[PDB]
Amino acid sequence: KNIESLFDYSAGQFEFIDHLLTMGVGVHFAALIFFLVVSQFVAPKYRIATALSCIVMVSAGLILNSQAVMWTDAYAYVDGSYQLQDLTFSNGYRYVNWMATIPCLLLQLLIVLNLKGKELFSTATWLILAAWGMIITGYVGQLYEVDDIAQLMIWGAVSTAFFVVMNWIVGTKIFKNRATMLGGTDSTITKVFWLMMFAWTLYPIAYLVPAFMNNADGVVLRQLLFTIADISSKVIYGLMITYIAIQQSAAAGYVPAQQALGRI
Ligand SMILES: *C\C=C(C)/C=C/C=C(C)/C=C/C1=C(C)CCCC1(C)C
Ligand SMILES: CCCCCCCC/C=C\CCCCCCCC(=O)O
Ligand SMILES: CCCCCCCC/C=C\CCCCCCCC(=O)O
Ligand SMILES: [Cl-]
Numbered sequence: 001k002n003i004e005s006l007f008d009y010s011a012g013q014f015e016f017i018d019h020l021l022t023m024g025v026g027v028h029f030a031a032l033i034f035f036l037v038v039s040q041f042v043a044p045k046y047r048i049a050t051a052l053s054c055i056v057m058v059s060a061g062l063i064l065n066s067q068a069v070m071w072t073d074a075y076a077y078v079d080g081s082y083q084l085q086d087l088t089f090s091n092g093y094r095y096v097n098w099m100a101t102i103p104c105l106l107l108q109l110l111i112v113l114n115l116k117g118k119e120l121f122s123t124a125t126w127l128i129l130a131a132w133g134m135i136i137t138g139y140v141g142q143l144y145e146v147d148d149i150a151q152l153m154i155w156g157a158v159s160t161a162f163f164v165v166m167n168w169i170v171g172t173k174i175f176k177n178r179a180t181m182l183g184g185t186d187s188t189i190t191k192v193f194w195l196m197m198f199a200w201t202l203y204p205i206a207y208l209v210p211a212f213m214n215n216a217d218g219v220v221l222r223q224l225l226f227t228i229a230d231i232s233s234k235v236i237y238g239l240m241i242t243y244i245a246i247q248q249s250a251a252a253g254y255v256p257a258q259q260a261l262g263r264i
């Protein structure tokens with residue numbers, strides 16, 4: 001149903017994509033080890049954010065590793081090209097973990113803005129419905145990327161409506177609670193908002209590729225625009241989120257954060 005099914009692939013295209021997804025995995029999982037080790041320097045009130053991206057990290061990673069294995073499963077070298085065999089490849093599984101990856105990554109931002117009690121609980125709820133809202137209509141959207149490009153654009157459309165509002169909630173929360181944040185991180189927090197704007201735009205480009213580049217190199221650039229997107233929203237976004245919690249932990253009198261900071 002997907003444009004990955006439509007083309008035969010050069011060995012350079014096939015090996016590049018396999019190498020892309022595998023470099024992927026090395027990185028969610030090596031970042032897995034570092035957010036484990038530093039979690040001990042984070043004060044009780046922030047420690048679930050670090051834990052949180054140890055879940056974003058093992059989630060993409062499994063989609064990611066599952067994608068590389070399905071990729072090699074699906075295609076074999078026949079008469080000079082990689083050709084589709086008995087099993088299919090698709091990106092529909094990256095969507096269901098988008099449903100997944102997101103609660104956490106908005107949850108982990110909210111933990112560091114010092115939301116608590118009823119504002120945390122109600123802000124998260126609206127944030128997971130809205131983002132899930134974006135996830136499921138473009139997942140619904142993407143399924144017609146061969147059969148109905150007009151369905152692409154219109155769910156594309158209905159997904160973009162959600163994104164913008166999601167971004168409006170987050171935006172509002174960040175700029176409203178800037179004042180509560182410690183240790184200089186009120187300037188830091190606004191780099192995160194921007195860093196997270198770039199990552200999440202790469203995904204509708206990444207998704208308009210069947211519309212504007214329905215060929216095998218488009219398939220490549222899709223997967224490419226994914227590794228950036230990914231390493232930035234899960235991985236790079238992640239490390240950003242973890243510096244803030246340690247810095248705030250230190251300004252709150254949490255001694256291990258203070259020794260950890262001073263050590264470097
Ligand atoms: C895993 C982390 C993140 C931040 C997931 C990001 C996905 C999006 C920002 C998807 C956006 C889409 C829209 C707005 C338009 C085409 C339909 C999509 C769901 C593919
Ligand atoms: C900011 C995170 C960066 C993510 C790293 C992605 C690395 C890809 C780097 C560019 C590779 C240039 C190689 C071009 C591939 C040749 C295309 C082909 O084989 O047909
Ligand atoms: C599967 C082939 C090999 C894949 C593994 C790649 C090797 C490791 C990659 C680099 C790790 C980058 C992640 C950042 C670690 C954060 C800790 C720190 O930066 O101080
Ligand atoms: Cl605490």
Ligand SMILES: [Cl-]
Nearest residue numbers: 060063094097
């Ligand atoms: Cl994912």
